[PDB]
Amino acid sequence: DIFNRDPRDHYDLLQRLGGGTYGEVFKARDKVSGDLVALKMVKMEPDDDVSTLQKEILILKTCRHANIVAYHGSYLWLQKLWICMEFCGAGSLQDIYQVTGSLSELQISYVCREVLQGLAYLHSQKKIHRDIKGANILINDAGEVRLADFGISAQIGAELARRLEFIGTPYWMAPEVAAVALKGGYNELCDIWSLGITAIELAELQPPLFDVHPLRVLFLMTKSGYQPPRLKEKGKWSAAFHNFIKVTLTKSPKKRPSATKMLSHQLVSQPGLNRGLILDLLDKLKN
Ligand SMILES: CNc1nc(Nc2ccc(N3CCOCC3)cc2)c(C(N)=O)nc1-c1cncc2c1ncn2C
């Protein structure tokens, strides 16, 4: 499961695709089959024992869903853990909308449906993603939608910096999560709020309040009079899209709908939602 060897023995490392608190991602080609894969390098911390690392790799191999990037295998080499995963050729939705411009209501509807399918699966496994945003939703050349990973819960490498990263960029987090280090916890419903913000992000090219200093956003969010965000242009988006934003951005998590409940919302249960919508979006990259 975790080969004690250099992944360069089996893979030809191509260009760097990007990275962050979750590691460094490289495009790579298998030397035998010729197939393209993604290789993520996670630097191991001084307290990352291999017994806990083994439990995590077991979770990475069993936590599987069509709307989550497939895990192929891993390598432990020179204090760096390398995870091999399916290659999503078009990159993230942020990589796409920062070329194409705003997604159509139908395109956002399909992405939100596919993400909710992945979130409903993660929540059935008692996992909370806690990292839903356009940059963490990848698209393959077939227009399929996949979450890059199952979220922040992987206890590998820079887990703490990844867990706390929202403090410097809290725009996608639910108010009960933005109430960091206060007595109230949170639950899986915070992912539903993050998906509502992601839908405004795909419509507007940035989440609400993106230009406000992160510490000011945290302050505003933990106020009793905080009004959840809304789409900026009412006379472009349908009543169904406005309502989907209204219910996903419910301030109280005790009133916010589950991922399974959201899958029957009129916006994401409408006919004609399929990968063809994203194939049309990818065609705009040529122009
Ligand atoms: C940099 N991140 C990732 N890039 C990938 N591929 C990819 C492919 C193409 C581009 N381009 C092409 C040229 O135009 C710009 C866009 C960018 C990226 C992948 C993958 N599987 O293909 N995966 C991750 C990734 C993996 N784990 C966790 C992650 C990840 N992203 C966020 N989180 C939290």
Residue 71 Cβ contacting ligand 1 at under 6 Å: no
Q: Is 19 annotated as a binding residue?
A: yes
Domains of the chain: 2-86 (3.30.200.20), 93-283 (1.10.510.10)
**Interior angle at CA 220, CA 213 and CA 175, nearest 5:** 105
Q: Are 166 and 218 in contact (CB under 8 A)?
A: no
CA–CA dist 141, 86 (Å, integer): 12
In whole angstroms, give the CA distance from residue 169 to residue 166: 5
In Å, what is the CA distance from 263 to each residue of 44, 109, 141, 144, 268? 38, 11, 25, 17, 6
Q: Binding residue per annotation — 75?
A: no
Residue with token string 């078009």: 90
Q: In Å, what resolution does this model reach?
A: 1.6
Is 1 an annotated catalytic residue?
A: no
The approach used to solve this structure was: X-ray
Q: Which of 84, 88, 145, 286 to mutate to test the pocket of ligand 1 (most atoms within 8 A of CB)?
A: 88
The alpha carbon of residue 199 and the mean position of all alpha carbons in its chain are separated, in whole angstroms, by: 12
| Ligand 1 binding pocket includes 87 (Cβ within 6 Å) | yes
**Element spanning 124, H or E:** helix 105-124
223-252 as b/e: b if 16+ CB within 10 A: eeeeebbebeeeeebeeebeebbebbbbbe
Q: How far is the CA of 93 from the centre of ligand 1 (A)?
A: 10
